[PDB]
Assembly symmetry: D2
Homo-oligomer: 198 residues x 4
């Protein structure tokens, strides 16, 4: 039995939708238990409301210290100027206690992301990899295992580093079927590796 | 005539000390006005106090929209697992309004950092560059203009991407004279470029 | 000279490698943008081929490129250099890497220190286009180049209605897995923007 | 075979380029660590030289490497590959870049998909050692390699009393601007840790 956490932040729902597909893929691996949780909001109340932040997410809020309860963690975040979101950064800064005891060492990790225009989607993933490496995570990219990555006929997210979605500058674009298939592939892929190492 | 902001976060003082050297270098350029400010704390009170956070920093707290009041900005941050600190990330996440109007486009930017063991010092700088590029900053590395970078006889911070210091895992190491000289070089180099573009 | 302040031309080199022509087309747009800046002299050159002849021929490499081949030493003759390369698995091409590996002498004398640099790229499917540029930035930083991204100055970047290259780090084009895609008008406009933007900064810094 | 279930050896390739021997010494330690893991077969090979003869000789290139030269196609013969390269301005060496550019056929067939990879590096002064590793990671990701950093599993990474190589991304050594430094005992311990760590994961995934 392997336990996977799908841990995400989502302000406008795009990452939340992708996380559902990530989790669906992971659950295809027999013997893998998948939990979806989100990191707490950090914006002050007035700014958050002014920005139209959503409060309908059913996923429970995770605590920093519980990450070591899992065998693999798939991290999801919207970009903030080519980095992970401040919400995810602040959450991961609180894992110093886990880092000092080696509590996450040798566990499996993978990353998915979203952007408004595609700009920064690659760097959001690989700069999250940096933090994973300091913890000693085994890092799983997806390469071109997802056949959708070869199709450039239409605006479509997804990179060899991990699944992505493109929300549009105004957030009007919802994740496409191809993007969700890439995320489902990533989830199952990370789950086969996590189960095999357990 | 030109205004430079040295904007930093410092929890244990190492970055604050480096910022003073950064500013000293910038003030060597005639006609350049240099201001030092810090980003607000984001840690909750109990964790911050339990962590031994310092409250003696004289620099005023900056606001996100004031960044456009300057012609060049030199950013300073300790690493959090190879990224900028959550404090700096959260602060810069609030610059979306400046980004939408192009308010920082074409300004000069440079970065310095600190780490406990040296690990992640390079990636802290260049993952901050990613955010600067999304704003359209002109990005200034220092290369090997600082002669101290060739001396590897002893532990010493500083990279071709920007000045750094090494604090030790317990924070007992203070910035060396060589590290501070590299920061002084960086400050003057950035200021010269900023003044020349004005 | 009595009564004269010399007016010196800022010099831009567009330096590229292109196997199937996509980067070559972009470089023309980069150069077109730079030539919009008065007082800027623009040169286009390419790096030498490094593949062995049989592999190159089997891969269908193009040999009709009119641009002269640059030498590593002449990089110091310019005030700004805009580098173009196709990706190789998310890095610059081996051809460009080999060429820049020969600039150790320029590095030791600081010959490129303080010059302006910018980067554009191409990929087959989009994968690695961002990293190709920013991992080229790393080498530029070791030389002390001032690094110029383009941000979202080009309005084309906000239009996600169709497959289109162009990043805040620099212009790109998407060639298709088989290389059958040609640079679109929008991608070329992003490259024209980059050239003019870089040329303006180089001229002002001169 | 009646009553027998085959025990298959996991295979590790330590693949490196070394101009002045620093990476070569590190590769020996990498391999030593891997051979500590039972059930792992360890091979050390190098990538071919790409510099022209006169430049190579003028630069003092070493010709005493006993490691046989690898071909790009044989990478698919292994379960895990630990790559070693000196930096060239914060990237992998052109020699390694040229070698990996020839793996397009393996990439198209997915021949390296799901294998284990890890990276070690060297620099003259420390500058760019982190980016050398993580920009090599990019290429590994395009092939679908599982990427293994070392984190802070090696206790030597906490000792900042002296100039020491090694990062959470992989082992490194610092050669000095003139190349006169040799890998220290601590740096070699980190490399031995990396080899054993990668070998354990490769054996478990097999
Ligand atoms: Cl979102
Ligand atoms: Cl600090
Ligand atoms: Cl091309
Ligand atoms: Cl070497």
């Amino acid at each position: 039995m392997a336990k996977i956490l799908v841990l995400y932040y989502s302000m406008y729902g795009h990452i939340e939708t992708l996380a559902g597909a990530i989790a669906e893929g992971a659950r295809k691996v027999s013997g893998v238990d998948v939990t979806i949780k989100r990191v707490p909001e950090t914006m002050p109340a007035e700014a958050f409301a002014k920005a139209g932040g959503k409060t309908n997410q059913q996923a429970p809020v995770a605590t920093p210290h519980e990450l070591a309860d899992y065998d693999g963690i798939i991290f999801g975040t919207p970009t903030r100027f080519g980095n992970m979101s401040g919400q995810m950064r602040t959450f991961l800064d609180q894992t110093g206690g886990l880092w000092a005891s080696g509590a996450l060492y040798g566990k499996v990790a993978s990353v998915f992301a979203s952007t408004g225009t595609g700009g920064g989607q690659e760097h959001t993933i690989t700069s999250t990899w940096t933090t994973l490496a300091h913890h000693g995570f085994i890092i799983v990219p997806i390469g071109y295992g997802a056949k959708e990555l070869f199709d450039v006929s239409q605006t479509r997210g997804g990179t060899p580093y991990g699944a992505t979605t493109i929300a549009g500058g105004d957030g009007s674009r919802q994740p496409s079927a191809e993007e969700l298939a890439i995320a489902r592939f990533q989830g199952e892929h990370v789950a086969k590796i996590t189960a095999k190492l357990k």
